[PDB]
């Protein structure tokens, strides 16, 4: 009755859950803006996903309050780079760390 | 004895070391007398003035009791507040401060019990100690982990596993989804499993799991040794093989050894996990001992990236304030005084980085929403039984724990009351995770 | 839980490590259950069998409770005897044995209190540890002192003395007649007095006193340091300047650091004085903690030439047996079981040399005949107040103490009851010693 | 065939090791041959020197791989003690940093000469910053000229 | 002489070192006198009491003969059993124990011959020595080899091969199927072939064979050197180039050098192969010498992962018991007394890991089923002639040996009598292995 | 087998290493066959030509038997003379030469016994080894002692003496008149007496005796250690404290360790005393083993200033030739072949300095004229019993021995037959020496 674990590559936070849709992505962005963090968008090759430094999509959205524009920028990054993994981050300036970081598209 | 070492009028300097002692005196003895007794025996140790006393500035080099307070709910005990000049201690020596405070006062025969409740470390003395080698934020940057608490596991049984079998437990635990695995406080180098073979096989398993998962992995390799030379050799071997984190027992191993290892870790870029073994012989008795909040301050002064603080959920709802208070002491930069949470002094840490909070002991998937709500993202959750007892294996248990963690974190981010809706959130996550579902079925 | 980790029929092997725990359980819980709980949590820590448990020899790698005894006079507590295989511990690691024994069992929630009363170290494990660097007889041979207890003094005040002033107290104390002076447990290196200046001026004073007296002199220079590197540097500087003895705080400094320093002392021919600071937070509570006899065994396993054991005279006549028992544990080669003296196990030490007994705290010329009768020649008597409080100075106080010591030793050698005739013996000695006479006049 | 391009990472204060590295990485991958540590940044509580060196080397390697041109960062090794300075320079060489930076006036001429000799021995390039030079060479009637300071610096090594 | 150093009533302590001597005395001399003579000359060396004798505890510091037994089948010899206190020897010094036992007693003129048959090492003294650096199980874990004996080969001729030619013999031998190749006891660094070139070319060949086969490979690189500095340099170079195993001559090189090299191997994670050169000048004579079982105990105390023990099949069926007994002494944790197998004392090893048994000398594919049945999986079979004499080359010979080994192991696992059915099993294997078939055709 | 490795016509080169083996073959086997067997197994070890054999110069790289001689008085044994090219051995490695000669040949099953009688070291190979660190003449120049044999003493009992008591035996022995005292082969570092305390107290006693007498004094401090690191540490400590001579056990300690220690002694200007412990297990059997003359050659090649050679007087008058022959081998620059004295080869030593001859064991004042006549001035006479058993003490015994030595030396210088007139000479000396007179009275 026991079932085996099927091994596969993972992508940090929220990678063990089913891939997020627009609603869940919007909820995460709303959380990020509610915590006072600055949303950011990054992308990199699948083979280079483990890189510490990803390609930055434009600049971090400082003071941005519209989750619709955040998601539109995510989709624009996906459209411009269709084979690249895309990550959404939230900069915490007080802690000099990231309050949230997860991939939106897992690449192909 | 009275007028000499206790001054009600004395206003303590911002550089003074302040200590709060819960004195349970023998019936009939004077409260001010007992306060001056703790102050004297912790600073000078005598009252009879000898000819060598007159060669020194007696008004300066002495500890003074400046305030006595009633203990709420305990008429047989009172709080003694004592101020110590910063000049009385070696700069950057938690060992010397600890010795000066607790060397002889606990053997005082005129009190039935003595507890050291809180100690105020001034910023001037704080700036001298090295502190945590890396800190929470630097460790997060190094491990490339953000937005969720870290997951750990203690490899069990504590006895019997060879190097390869211990490695083949660690490998499945890590490849299942845990960020870290943990060497037990007992495992440093035993006849059934030598430390070098431990380090080699553990590094092999960690590298294999990291390659097969895509996430940075680690194991708190225990470097507690009979000798500092052996400890330094084990830490150097861990760095040579590439282990990103090691573990030390800072109480049984010793504060001097822990400070040296923390300085070495800061020098060599190796993360340090701290285990609090023996802490119960010291901090459990309510009327005699030194508090775990004081031990936490001492540990973060000495240096360490992780520290066991308790599971919080393991106590009743009305007994969580002291644990939360010492959690804030460990993690936050400035902790205001809070008598309800047991914080007796304003504690300014300046720029010293925080230390990750470790929750371990009898906790599984069901406690997890409460654990997330209480600890926040800056904590490490350890699942020994909750991972090894999984019917499908260590990898399946780790996957269940990771899925539950991610679901709870997302639920908290969405603005839901994760403690109120924990069962619903976990069930919704289990609709996509058979391992998680069978985990709740096992541990319900 | 019951049948698995407690075997009434089990006969413990001569190589097994045996531990005796005084369990004060919660009312209603089973005695055998609590005994198995201490045995399990001190050896394996769990009862739920996981799949990794089946990979090991569970029958071997576990601690077992083999005997439960009533506590005389305490119906709420019982004695649990637990046997541990020698394979469970690192060879020659008091740190590892101590951690395995006391890591988590004292935090057990099903018992109100847990005390570790006695621990049996088998000769097989004893032969692995280095033990005392020199021992009583080798230290006597090196110092050329025989037939009388050694005399020491703690330099007071603990605070304020510069290097030269501390040296000019030590010099008069030594030239007065004391074999040793003692650095306080607080003095390692403070802003008012740095450690290098301490060592230099102390060595100058010791050399001057030795030259002016004709007897070998020493000072327990404190090498307790924030880091093992600093401790080793201070010990090496003491050896370089020629100091014959150093001092360490083996509890606050740490067991690992103490073992390393003891090994270094054995290697470099430097005597080691051990101070027992903090011991009261551990051994004072009658229902929770670890006994000072266990601490004494641990210290002599780690290494040390001197050890504070208490003044014995400081307790009532009916409460001296436990102190005498741990004195025998520290000094004698084989200590038979003695329930009256608190010796729960036969303790065979083999060839490991004994450790000098140090009596200190509130003792003066009047306690001295009792001190001699109780301790014998193989002990060190410390006179801080009894030397510094002398109206004629440190040298006169030391001369008084030395004259009293020699008179008491000769009286004991002549076959007199020194405790019964103490006043007469001291008066007869004072007929030739004005310093001694004024000493009794001061401290009567 | 062209002058080299550099950039000073700003602000002088506040950037963590990773954030400073993620400024350096974009600066280098954009086209600059070098980036520059500020004369203030040697090892501060908000950003320790070892983390600086590690993250800077990571960013430099990533930019070099993604561009195809040799990259560098003047890692500041100015330290309170010559032992600390030598340790930082040795760590930079160990991690593979091709160039380091020193403050030759505030750090001292003896320290600068020793560091220059070490750089010549170990094949590490040395960037020299002229902090404080204005307290000396600005006054037209009292001081020592920056041309004399330049001669002194090139004699010392850089 | 008689009453002083032999006590029939003495019961030997569990910590006592016991030695059994086969005494072939001069006709007419007393058996008890000769036993006391061996006991005295091996412990104190004299009978005339001098004034310095009275300064010591003569009753303690002496070896005593407690039992005399007849030798079955030899009326001219008797067995003398002598007990030695553990205090008589340096802790962890096989050199000191060996010297104390055999320094002068073999030159005794009142006996025609003296043989040291067995020596009892108590667990207390066993726990002090380092023992084998890795042991059988740890070596198996490191090499990833289970379920079959290991295969080795001695590269021949002993003389003439350059570094590259020796490497091109080793490469074919390893790529043919042998787990190991062996440097000869003569080859450390000769003018025709220097040691550094040996190590480099051997490592190249081993790496090439490992890459081309998919199995871990090794070569016992000889580090026996004129000086310990040279030996340590060669071992360090082997570790630097990555050689997993080295070889030492523990008798000709010396017990001190072997112990140092074993400690270095345990420290650096390098396997140690031990060759028993010269053992015949010592253990061959039936009436004078020290037995190879005692030499095996000494070697496993000193440290080593492999040890030559003989081919067992090389003796008649009625002369195999002593070889099997010392095989059990080398490999097993506890060997009960067995007079038929030559085990005179119960030998408790505790947790010290076993040592691989090496069978070498005149053995080929035909002896192999008997070799497997006798030695089991925990042994190394060496085929010098049986691999190099193969008509198709070293690779073909190694393939033949490996196929025969796997077939015999599978036949044993299936429950067949491999010795009774050896020819049938080998023929059935040869139906799929032309190299094996031609190997039996060559060596029939 | 025959034609290949034995050449009757071969004339051995002056650079060839020659070995003489006494072969006691199994009845019926051919003498030339057995000689070729020893030659082959000591050089190549096989007869079956393999493909790797054809890659080398087989005519060169092999040992050849060139002469077979009858053993006088033994029809069951014959002498085999074998020549070895100098190319077969590492330059300056007694370890390698010894291994090549005796690795496997003694385990040959076709001979009942094999003895290595003599080995010829060519001057070319002799010039490579370091040899004795100082030599007889350089040691005499350093110690400022000429014209008489040196006097030594073994401190007894071998067990029980503390450092100070051993020193207070050494001090009286040296101040009595002996040039040296001797640590026993058992004493390196025991629990009852540690090596550092030995070295310190021995140096103190030696310095005191030298100051009180006016003659250079020394003690062979034993540096035989479990590890070469420990041995080098002990030798370095001896040099640091100023000990002029140390002692090593070159057989039990090992030839590699002895060569390293001899090189260190030559580098650091420290004299080396060599003890021959275990030599009896090797050289006693007349039909199997390696001769003490070969062991003496090996020792002087390795390095050493003193060497035990036997008392010579301990054998009958008709059995002294072999002892005298190996004495000449140890001391003289060129020893011609002498079958009566057991010298089978002309042995040219060139410029290598001689080694002092040590006579020890059961010798006292009466043997002394014979000892002087036999050994000459270039020898060391050891008096353990003959000094410690003196009724008036160690100093009186040493004075008696010294007076007897000086009287015998003067009698020899005057041209008297000291052996014929020994009693008269000793009595005439005793007319001025009461200690000497009572010494003869005790030992008559």
Residue numbers in the entry:
A (entry chain O): 3 to 110
B (entry chain G), C (entry chain A), E (entry chain E), F (entry chain C): 13 to 456
D (entry chain F): 159 to 316
In the authors' words:
The carboxysome encapsulates carbonic anhydrase and the primary CO2-fixing enzyme, ribulose-1,5-bisphosphate carboxylase oxygenase (Rubisco), within a protein shell that structurally resembles a virus capsid. Rubisco is among the most abundant components of carboxysomes. It is generally understood that Rubiscos are densely encapsulated within the carboxysome to overcome its slow turnover rate and off-pathway oxygen reaction. The intrinsically disordered but highly conserved CsoS2 is thought to serve as the scaffolding protein connecting the carboxysome shell using its C-terminal region to Rubisco through its N-terminus. Using cryo-electron tomography, we determine the distinct 3D organization of Rubisco inside two distant α-carboxysomes from a marine α-cyanobacterium Cyanobium sp. PCC 7001 where Rubiscos are organized in three concentric layers, and from a chemoautotrophic bacterium Halothiobacillus neapolitanus where they form intertwining spirals.
Cryo-ET STA of Rubiscos in native Halo carboxysomes resulted in a density map at 3.3 Å resolution, which allows a real-space refinement of the Rubisco structure. Visual inspection of the tomographic reconstructions revealed that the Rubisco organization within Halo carboxysomes is very different from those within Cyanobium carboxysomes: Halo Rubiscos form intertwined spirals instead of concentric layers (yellow arrow). Intriguingly, unlike the extra CsoS2 density identified in the Cyanobium Rubisco map, we observed no additional density corresponding to the CsoS2 peptide. We reasoned that this might be due to a lower overall occupancy of CsoS2 with Halo Rubisco and speculated that CsoS2 might have distinct associations with subpopulations of Rubisco. Therefore, we further divided Rubisco spatially and obtained STA maps of Rubisco from those close to the shell and those within 30 nm from the center, separately. Remarkably, there is a clear density corresponding to the CsoS2 helical peptide in the Rubisco complexes adjacent to the shell but is absent in the Rubiscos near the center of the carboxysome. To understand the molecular interactions between Rubiscos in the string-like assembly, we further determined the Rubisco dimer structure at 4.1 Å resolution using cryo-ET STA and docked the atomic model of Halo Rubisco. In Halo α-carboxysomes, CsoS2 assists in organizing the Rubiscos adjacent to the shell (Mode I), or with the truncated isoform CsoS2A (in red, Mode II), while Rubiscos spiral strings in the inner core are mediated by CbbS and do not require CsoS2 (Mode III). Protein abundance analysis revealed that the relative CsoS2 content in Halo carboxysomes was twofold of that in Cyanobium carboxysomes at the same Rubisco level, which might contribute to the different packing patterns observed.
